[PDB]
Amino acid sequence: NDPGNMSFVKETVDKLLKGYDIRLRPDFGGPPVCVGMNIDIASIDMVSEVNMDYTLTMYFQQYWRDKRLAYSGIPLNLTLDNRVADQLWVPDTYFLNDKKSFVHGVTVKNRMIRLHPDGTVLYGLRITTTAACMMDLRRYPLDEQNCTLEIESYGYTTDDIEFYWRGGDKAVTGVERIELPQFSIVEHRLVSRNVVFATGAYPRLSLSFRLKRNIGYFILQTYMPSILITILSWVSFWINYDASAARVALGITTVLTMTTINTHLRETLPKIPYVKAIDMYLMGCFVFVFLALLEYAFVNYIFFSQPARAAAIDRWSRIVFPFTFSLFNLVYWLYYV
Template sequence: MTWELYFTTLKLIIILFLRLTMCLESAVISKGNDRLANVTQTISRLLDGYDIRLRPNFGGDPLYVGMDLTIASFDSISEVNMDYTITMYLNQYWKDERLAFSDEEEILTLSGDFAEKIWVPDTFFANDKNSFLHDVTERNKLVRLNGDGSITYGMRFTTTLACMMDLHYYPLDSQNCTVEIESYGYTVTDVVMYWKEWPVRGVEDAELPQFTIIGYETNDRIEQLATGSYQRLSLSFKLQRNIGYFVFQTYLPSILIVMLSWVSFWINHEATRATLALV
């Protein structure tokens, strides 16, 4: 009887444990489904009646848009075309009170497609020649929405930018190449861009065979154009050419070829075959 009672009790304990586990799993799943439903309803509510054509605080004070960059790589520099190519991450920050959904510090990380449903700055690069947004395996875009309506909008792309170079002192020269960021359509009465506290990252890790990046600086200015006054952010890279690279790639081979040609002067003129062999 003692063993039968023991096994019966153990069986009941196991059954109770399994049922409790199932109840907890159901509660977790139910809670997850409730949160998913709440988030879906929240997003639908925010976009209901949202006018993508109007900037935040339309008709009021200018909208402040923060910027920061992370340099992924310096891909190439061309003296012939007077340009350089870099891959970078561009993050933009602004606040759209129409998208506020909570008083708490809650953050929603959304797909990049969400950016097509809300107002985003019409940012462009004033010295751009050619650019493309990376799309493997998906379009490299990031959208984060805070409860108070603050938005983080990031993207990864490769761009070729114009860089006017002074080559008078080549190959002992140094160059300044810039990234010029500006709003295409919004003047300073509508949108004011500014650099964040840490505006640039990744420069220290970037490497180039022909140049050394000896520094960079950021600044901003008002650009006066025919259509109005626009805020322009500028990032300038100070590039010092590596003389050692050109010594081994250009000068040393040229010197060796010239020295080799002198050997023909030390060969007896009657040694025709040897002279022809050098030629």
């Protein structure tokens, strides 16, 4: 009688679980059970190009109605201990593209079960998942990436279970509060569809983010050092051509440093067989510093027989190299922006 009478509540819950078969889905043999899903994204831990995946922490909630759990006489929503979920049927929801995922278990399993008088079940889970995201690094680091989270039922087909985003476009929250130092989230989308396999058609929910990579880190880390090395190679043009050791040292160091910058950057990224946007810039800067050393090799070859021509080549190189490199940056930054 009394909702505050725990003895009466215990009798009501025991009656619900008496004869309850966890092996059978709600409305077994009849219409499919509709499962509504909402996601509260706590954070996106990291985005890795090397492993081609991202780490996501979220509050995963499932909404469905089980008539076997309908109770009367208690005008309240029953929030039970999370351990009761082992005595109830739950959807076999799994993430299609996940690589490693777990449910937090401190201090207890991060799980929620809330019952409703009509038999509606609220099932919440705090899950940290690492989901695979293949990335196209051709325009890297000025690339825009699209990473998805695929939600699907494992065993039950569309004849048994149906998926939908509960709340429509507002089913997923917390996207605007995600703080990625390297990326900005341009847009997120929700997709519901059915995928046909050899064992039947299965419900599918898709959550996708469009990530825009910030360029600030790469300007300070790769682009500026490459520019400084290229400018450093131009110093030899003002050095006297009789200083063979000095000018060759400028040519050697700038050429070798440019190669080390190019190779070191590729080591950090995964072994991809195509040229990236930054690789085009680094290889472009290598030509300028290589031609600067070849410029002195030409001057050193003829400065004895033709000192006048050698001086003109040095004088013209002081203008052509800064001018050509400025144009190279102009065409480069217009293409990739």
